[PDB]
Write a protein that binds this ligand. Structure first.
Ligand SMILES: Nc1nc2c(ncn2[C@@H]2O[C@H](COP(=O)(O)CP(=O)(O)OP(=O)(O)O)[C@@H](O)[C@H]2O)c(=O)[nH]1
Ligand SMILES: Nc1nc2c(ncn2[C@@H]2O[C@H](COP(=O)(O)CP(=O)(O)OP(=O)(O)O)[C@@H](O)[C@H]2O)c(=O)[nH]1
Ligand SMILES: Nc1nc2c(ncn2[C@@H]2O[C@H](COP(=O)(O)CP(=O)(O)OP(=O)(O)O)[C@@H](O)[C@H]2O)c(=O)[nH]1
Ligand SMILES: Nc1nc2c(ncn2[C@@H]2O[C@H](COP(=O)(O)CP(=O)(O)OP(=O)(O)O)[C@@H](O)[C@H]2O)c(=O)[nH]1
Lengths: 326, 326, 326, 326
């Protein structure tokens, strides 16, 4: 009941909340959207029907009610039901998987969706939000990110990631949601297929850059810019695709291995040149920042005072039901 | 005849008096409530029917009339009838067992209920009141608390306790009742399941923290705060779940192993951010204070003057019925 | 004295009562029927003669009078006499074993008949009624159902089961009887062999699906629908066979591994497309529901008050005949 | 000279008087009846012939003339002559031993008959009347009840008892007789074997419940109810068998380990659902009441004034024949 050119996979509660602003676009036929979550708590007022909502179910066929930031809890159930999701909801030509590395549901169904879509040969770009409010969230972000890195090397296909941070620059979760929504909205225009000079084969090589560049397949970061001022700082990316409005000057000074051009129709809401840039030079910084939080919480964990423990003989004395010793 | 989302187990006379303020909520469907006691002395004017009241019975099937602050008197009867209580009164999804460590009934049926609910896999939080007015009460409080500590280690599942004191800061029993009623009222909102971003699995891991944190299972203290000023003193809790009103700023500076977020509906009576904090750093202080009272009463007991005993030969002389010396 | 195209094995009291509505069909040559039971109490007014009734006999050659919901009582006798039943009453080309999982007779002679018929290479479909009124009935249903699951894996041949529930939707036993009678009546038309486009080899592969599908042999659930509305909910079965009336549209949207078609003669009482769907996706739900009742009765059993026991010395004192102590 | 489906053993004077209302039923072939007593005082006008009356005889082969509430007087003779009673009067398929725990004859021949019938493998249900008018009656009732409990525990077979009280609710002996007669009539209807869905094995497992339930064999109390209102108070029985009239709704809300169903013929005098319920939760109350009566009578006995005893020297003086002092 929707156009399947671009498919948005709002995985997890964080992905569902971020994608809740794209429900109107589905009605207008811009793109198809599918919610994937282990709980229906966030989705109590979605405009889309249950035909666009999938909730993971246990062995008894009953819907789960969240993972509670515990990735290992429902890993088997989620990984087993991922193929079923793709059959019921056919992936679009270009897929946008949105999830959070910190939760226990989005960070398991997210990489599982990306791995299956990449293995099937689909074109998928992941929008990622990472939080470090707790030790559990930080460890989940560390393990999920390493999982994606292992996915790119294991599948020999790059995993394009639009990374985001909850605590960056003191931005609230509302601010981060606006940032991600801008990236998804721009990716919708890029993947719409209505661009004059941009073909499907061009975007296939853009997303699967090692086909053309010959570089080693690894996780790649996607950055989106407007105007031409971004060329000074990122003059040497792996690849980039730029969409220009009518009678717009090209971008110069960028020496990329691969490049693409597109011309946005006058009706579409793009008024200045928009560039989608792939690079892996900032991956080391992102990994270091994640490891910094992990080290910080490990040091803080080692500062925990040991809890007062009752004697082991007392426990043996409390073998009576109710653990009463009198 | 009541909603079973949250179940309040008013165990003992102290628990019954504290819970008597929640009878109106039962009629309004907020939560289900069950009185558990060895006597009907306090429950002579309860609005709830006898279907919500369970009184322990002896071997002959006749209701008891209290334990008289003697824990060992009816321990076998209470522990044997605990499973029957849970069948007749089905435990709610979240259970709140309220009892006093000093009495002989609440301090036995309380830990028995908690041990059975934890063993069955239910989610239970205990509200506890401790008194040290008499040596018997002090020894009972010391004994019951050690029993709970052995219960947490024996069941490998934490026993969350909202600890309270009768003699703290010169507060009367009425003042302590208001303090506990606030905690139970807030726990009712937390466990209501109507929070937007809070799932049952989030609360399951919050209550059973060693699943997520990996810490050793032990008795854990629960503290509840409003606003954000509490972050300065308790910046290092094991876990904490915060419920925010509409457009409320998050809590910063708290580095917990696990945390949860929730958003209170506008209709519910929460107007400022309420935090439910779990920590075990004050357990040593509580145990020390309890042991201080026990030492004080042991010293006072050793100062008792020996009662003037009649001669043993006189006892042999008074073997006549009625013990008459003539 | 009857046509042997379809054979109905009314096993047990529940099976005999359900099948008592098919006695008229036997006289009209629609199918052959055989009552198998450990007691003749229910069969005091059957139109069919004793040549169509088999009652289990003990070692002395005398007919039993029921099992009393005790499966283990006559398991040896029943399993020993099953081959004798099949010789005296030759199984039809398609067999319909009807029995209840709760009783002690139908739940032993039922699976015994199914295991023998499957081992001999016959084509058998079981109609099953499960009850959970008592702990004994629930445990019998749990053990019988697991027995059938072990039968399918041990024989490497699926055990097709038309599952039914006594307490489902508050339906009375009369309502469940009507539901089963409809399924048996439809299976009679399917197995009649008078369908234009349906062959015996097609039905052989339909019942023994792993021959064609290659799936693992296990217990399979049979569901029957009229019309085409069922396709929305069960669009992904293992296999399904549909019987269409004259000039009836085919079923679309169902992606099954195996499928069959048949055209009902105009005289036969089928007026809309009837589908026979095999699936194992609801087996987990059925097993969970059975285990839920078993857990409930185990908890209820642990709440039993221990019976008052006279002293062991008193028993030793009552060694005198008549157990009188004076 | 009578139908042997149900056998009524009217033991003792109390049993004979209660059973005197069933002679017409014996004349109509409903059931066989046998009077067993140590005296013929009550049986001076019985319609039944002496072939249905057995009177205990002493060593010299002459009939006794009662025990006079002294159990130990003729215990050996009764225990020795019990097998002869069973040989001369063949026990029915279901036996109903009716006796009083207070007398010296019924309370000895009753338990002996029950123990012999249980040992032989027969199915026996005891109707019991207990009186506490005298200390001797109270002690006899206590001793007989303890003996029955010992028999149930030592035979590993439950002793089903329909307990009755003479002094309960101020009911006269006529009222207790009517109650016991109603219970016996209902048991006769249950045991008639003419019920549609009820087998002999069903009743065998119902009476010998540890075969099915697995519970410890002990004395079990039988209670009979009409309608469905009894479910509220006795929702947790060990077992229960219900007889329904034509088109009668089943009983719901009763969670028993074992249960049976039967359908009364339209001719039989049952117009509403009749339930026979087995439970051991009220045994403690009965034992407590009996012990309370025994304690009361012991206290009253200890208050007896010592009889004025003549001097022992006077007794030595009165060694003359006739004990004359002169
Ligand atoms: N920037 C955002 N961060 C969010 C949002 N929702 C949650 N989060 C953050 O993500 C983390 C929790 O991730 P999720 O809410 O997706 C948890 P998940 O869906 O995986 O499990 P359940 O909560 O059991 O559904 C935590 O740090 C939250 O503060 C959101 O809309 N925006
Ligand atoms: N803060 C409160 N303390 C209470 C309250 N009621 C009793 N207590 C205190 O608890 C202690 C006695 O415990 P309980 O009254 O619960 C006695 P228990 O129920 O175990 O036995 P019974 O009195 O025979 O029912 C003693 O120190 C009391 O002062 C109350 O409503 N609030
Ligand atoms: N839906 C139905 N359930 C039935 C019917 N007859 C019995 N039952 C249920 O099945 C259960 C008892 O099973 P059966 O009567 O078949 C006992 P079985 O034949 O195995 O042993 P006997 O009674 O000794 O012959 C119990 O729950 C009954 O309520 C029936 O006609 N329909
Ligand atoms: N409810 C009834 N109680 C009875 C009846 N007959 C006697 N009793 C009571 O039972 C007690 C005496 O028991 P029995 O009459 O059976 C004396 P038993 O037969 O053992 O000796 P004999 O009197 O020498 O035959 C005493 O309390 C009587 O009041 C009766 O018909 N109904």
């Amino acid at each position: 009941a929707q156009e399947n050119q671009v498919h948005i996979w709002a995985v997890g509660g964080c992905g569902g909340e971020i994608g809740s602003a794209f429900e109107g676009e589905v009605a207008k036929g811009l793109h198809s959207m599918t919610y994937v979550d282990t709980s229906r708590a966030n989705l109590r007022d979605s405009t889309l029907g249950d035909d666009h909502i999938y909730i993971f179910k246990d062995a008894a066929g009953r819907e789960l009610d969240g993972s509670g930031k515990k990735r290992d809890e429902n890993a088997e159930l989620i990984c087993s039901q991922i193929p079923g999701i793709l059959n019921k909801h056919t992936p679009g030509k270009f897929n946008i998987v949105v999830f959070s590395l910190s939760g226990g549901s989005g960070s398991v169904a997210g990489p599982a969706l990306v791995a299956n879509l990449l293995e099937r040969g689909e074109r998928v770009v992941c929008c990622i939000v990472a939080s470090f409010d707790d030790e559990r969230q930080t460890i989940n972000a560390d393990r999920t990110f390493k999982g994606l890195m292992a996915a790119a090397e294991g599948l020999k296909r790059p995993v394009i990631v639009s990374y985001h941070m909850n605590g960056e620059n003191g931005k609230s979760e509302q601010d981060v949601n606006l940032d991600v929504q801008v990236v998804i909205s721009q990716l919708c225009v890029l993947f719409s297929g209505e661009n004059r000079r941009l073909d499907s084969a061009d975007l296939e090589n853009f997303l699967n850059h090692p086909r053309v560049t010959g570089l080693e397949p690894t996780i790649t970061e996607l950055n989106t810019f407007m105007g031409y001022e971004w060329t000074k700082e990122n003059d040497s990316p792996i690849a980039f695709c730029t969409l220009y409005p009518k009678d717009a000057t090209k971008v110069m000074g960028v020496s990329a291995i691969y490049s693409c051009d597109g011309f946005v129709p006058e009706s579409s809401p793009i008024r200045e040149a928009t560039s989608f840039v792939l690079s892996t030079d900032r991956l080391g910084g992102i990994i270091k920042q994640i490891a910094d939080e992990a080290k910080r919480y490990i040091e803080h964990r080692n500062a925990r005072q040991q809890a007062p423990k009752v004697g082991d003989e007392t426990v043996a004395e409390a073998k009576n039901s109710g653990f009463l010793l009198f």
